[PDB]
Amino acid sequence: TGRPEWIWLALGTALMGLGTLYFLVKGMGVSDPDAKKFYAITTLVPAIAFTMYLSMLLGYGLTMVPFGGEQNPIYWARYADWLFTTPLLLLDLALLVDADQGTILALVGADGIMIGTGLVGALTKVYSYRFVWWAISTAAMLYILYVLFFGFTSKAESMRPEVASTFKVLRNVTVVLWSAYPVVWLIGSEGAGIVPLNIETLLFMVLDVSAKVGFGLILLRSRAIFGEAE
Ligand SMILES: CCCCCCCC/C=C\CCCCCCCC(=O)OC[C@H](O)CO
């Protein structure tokens, strides 16, 4: 409670934990193999985020990085979370549209580059270089968003209508929410430092819960997750 952002870390921990438990109960008894994949991916996402939020709440996922002549508090646990949860969210989208394996690898690999370069930027001690890493990570994000809109055209013709509808909604949610992350980083404690860490932490909490639990609720309530069966 010594760090003002503790309240948002505590709320994030609670919301990710509750979301995990809700998806775990909702997925009980699901037998359809396709739906099992979506429940597994989508429950694993807030479960991982729960552990990383808790690690930030308890102080383990925080480190001090010297730059700008200050000791800057950097929550590195965010990147350990996103390293696994962001490819999993992309996998949800890719499986919906029955993406080619090559497209899945392009997405997951670009996503690993996005998170890894974000982590390097977050830990870099030379201030100006932090924004070089931010730019590379943003380029990887833009590549991901490009694929989400322009890499699935060969699947549109054979796509079930409920699949197309649910994918379109989830893709829109993804572009809007994922785009905000580089802005928050750029203006917050990692970047230019014009928004204080407590407000940056609130912003990431709202984004994370929306991108994980909100996304998850939209997906797991849809009939698109079930194979077409009589
Ligand atoms: C000037 C420096 C230029 C280099 C900057 C690179 C650093 C990372 C930036 C963006 C990630 C690019 C992601 C690379 C993944 C591309 C995979 C691919 O090409 O997939 C095509 C295939 O058809 C499947 O759809």
Side-chain angles (χ1 to χ4, degrees), residues 1-152 154-156 158-167 169-220 222-230:
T1 305
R3 296 165 268 146
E5 69 272 16
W6 82 267
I7 183 58
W8 315 121
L9 297 177
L11 190 52
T13 300
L15 292 172
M16 294 301 183
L18 290 170
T20 301
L21 292 174
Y22 175 73
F23 295 153
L24 196 69
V25 169
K26 194 181 190 299
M28 266 193 310
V30 172
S31 65
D32 179 68
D34 286 340
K36 282 179 159 187
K37 283 180 239 169
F38 289 113
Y39 270 100
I41 295 168
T42 308
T43 304
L44 185 55
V45 164
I48 292 161
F50 160 81
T51 69
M52 292 300 93
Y53 263 87
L54 179 63
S55 87
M56 295 189 284
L57 177 66
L58 301 184
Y60 184 84
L62 175 62
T63 193
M64 298 297 246
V65 181
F67 64 82
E70 316 188 326
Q71 295 296 323
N72 298 279
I74 299 299
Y75 284 106
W76 62 265
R78 300 199 188 279
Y79 305 89
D81 174 339
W82 297 343
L83 180 65
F84 299 100
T85 60
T86 58
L88 284 171
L89 290 162
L90 294 179
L91 188 59
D92 263 343
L93 295 180
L95 290 177
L96 263 188
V97 302
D98 194 20
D100 293 329
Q101 289 182 355
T103 309
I104 295 175
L105 180 56
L107 285 166
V108 172
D111 189 280
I113 290 167
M114 183 183 76
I115 303 304
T117 59
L119 174 61
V120 169
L123 300 181
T124 281
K125 301 178 178 177
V126 179
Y127 185 64
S128 66
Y129 295 170
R130 301 175 65 83
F131 304 96
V132 173
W133 294 110
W134 176 92
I136 296 167
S137 178
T138 298
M141 188 196 70
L142 292 172
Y143 177 78
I144 292 165
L145 298 180
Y146 174 86
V147 174
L148 294 183
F149 283 91
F150 302 100
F152 298 146
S154 65
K155 313 287 166 175
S158 86
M159 208 180 300
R160 291 148 55 186
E162 66 278 18
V163 168
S165 176
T166 298
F167 171 72
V169 170
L170 292 179
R171 174 173 68 185
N172 288 152
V173 169
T174 296
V175 176
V176 170
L177 294 181
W178 286 41
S179 296
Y181 284 80
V183 179
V184 174
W185 196 103
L186 189 66
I187 68 186
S189 55
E190 285 82 19
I194 66 188
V195 174
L197 175 56
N198 69 309
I199 298 306
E200 169 193 342
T201 306
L202 165 62
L203 295 174
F204 278 139
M205 186 209 75
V206 170
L207 291 170
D208 283 341
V209 173
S210 297
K212 297 184 165 75
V213 181
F215 176 107
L217 285 166
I218 294 167
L219 176 63
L220 297 177
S222 171
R223 285 305 300 182
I225 67 174
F226 290 88
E228 222 191 355
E230 197 49 44

